[PDB]
Structure formats: structure tokens, C-alpha cells
Amino acid sequence: EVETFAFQAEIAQLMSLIINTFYSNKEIFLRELISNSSDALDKIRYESLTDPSKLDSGKELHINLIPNKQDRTLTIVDTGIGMTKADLINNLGTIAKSGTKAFMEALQAGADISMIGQFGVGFYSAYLVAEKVTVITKHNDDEQYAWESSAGGSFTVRTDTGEPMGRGTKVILHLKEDQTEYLEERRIKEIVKKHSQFIGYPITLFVEK
Numbered sequence: 001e002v003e004t005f006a007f008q009a010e011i012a013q014l015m016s017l018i019i020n021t022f023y024s025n026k027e028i029f030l031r032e033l034i035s036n037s038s039d040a041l042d043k044i045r046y047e048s049l050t051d052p053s054k055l056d057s058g059k060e061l062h063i064n065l066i067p068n069k070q071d072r073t074l075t076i077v078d079t080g081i082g083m084t085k086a087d088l089i090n091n092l093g094t095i096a097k098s099g100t101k102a103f104m105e106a107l108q109a110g111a112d113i114s115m116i117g118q119f120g121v122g123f124y125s126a127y128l129v130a131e132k133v134t135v136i137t138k139h140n141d142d143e144q145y146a147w148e149s150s151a152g153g154s155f156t157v158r159t160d161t162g163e164p165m166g167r168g169t170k171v172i173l174h175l176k177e178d179q180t181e182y183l184e185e186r187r188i189k190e191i192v193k194k195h196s197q198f199i200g201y202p203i204t205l206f207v208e209k
Ligand SMILES: C#Cc1cccc(NC(C)=O)c1
Pocket: 014, 017, 018, 019, 021, 023, 104, 107, 113
């Protein structure tokens, strides 16, 4: 049972600008997704300060980076607060319509693309390197769901029957054919050290066979 939704016109426009604009500094996608994970971890930590049972779904607060060269995927896993189905449909828990407007007004006033995260829409920088993005998420108050989009104006949401997650979010980047440098250990390490070296949660880069 798969539900298909249209992106709001402003989000479709942002996504097409990310995909079509010539812009060589693609590595910022990983900074933005790690930042989103750190925000999601801060939220479940804050909730747990007054209600410890919010961590019954998992006490460890961390970020894992999982490259898979056979599948040509880079997966960013966090054990943050996760998203409900309603959150997924509402632009993955963002204020993407007003954020896109503020981002585009900022660019007209002298910002560049790499400030995208300041406007709350850093998630969509995934499309700098991915032809398809899958988001698996589990929030304490809802069931496990899978969101998916190859851009083109639409996304799908379905109940996820895969590996139970406990709590958190998994962003699976199905990489473009010419973007496989982001699966190499030395390249990922370089980017994490350059852009994410002070994130307050452990970031573990998995290795492959
Ligand atoms: C990449 C990219 C991107 C994201 C938002 C807006 C724009 N448009 C420009 C710079 O003309 C480009």
C-alpha cells in the first residue's frame, strides 16, 4: 500500500534548482545531513530530561555513516527523535515553503548555495549527489515509515516492513553514477573533519569488506 504525493510547487522548484544548477561544491550535502541528525538527537535528549521513558526505544544517541559500494548507497543513520507519518508528508518536519522563500531571497541579496542549512531546507541538498533518496523513520508516537523520492515532482510514503529501527531516522542516498567518491573512506573522513568536526554526538564511519 503505497501513497503518492505531489511536492508543493515551491519545494519542487528548489529541488529542480539543486539538480540542474552548475555547482561544484557538492560535498556540503553530508554536513547538512549530519547537522539535521544532530538536531534530531538534541530533540529526543531534551524530551528525555523530564521523561526518561522516552529513551525506552534506545538509550544511545549517535550517528553512523554506512557506505555500500555494491548497492552504490551512502546511508546516514541517527537515533534521534524520528518523524511521524504526518511529519514525513509535511516536508520531512521542515518549514520548507517559507524556508525556500527565505533562501531564494537570501541568494538575491548575496548568499550562496552553501548557506542552504540556515533556511531549514538543508535536507534537499541530498539531491546534489543522489538520484533517489529513501528516508526510513520511527518516532515514539507512530509506526515505522519509508519516504522516497527521485524528484520529478512527487514522493511516496509507505509503511516499512523492513528491519525495525527502534527510534530515529535513516537517510539512504542512492548515488549518481559520477558521485561515487562519497563511498570512499578517505573522502568521507576528509569531509567529516572539514565540516562536522565539533558535532556533539559520536560519528562512526563504517568500513566495508
Ligand atoms: C544548487 C543550487 C541552488 C539552490 C537554490 C537556488 C539556486 N539558484 C540560483 C543560485 O540561481 C541554486
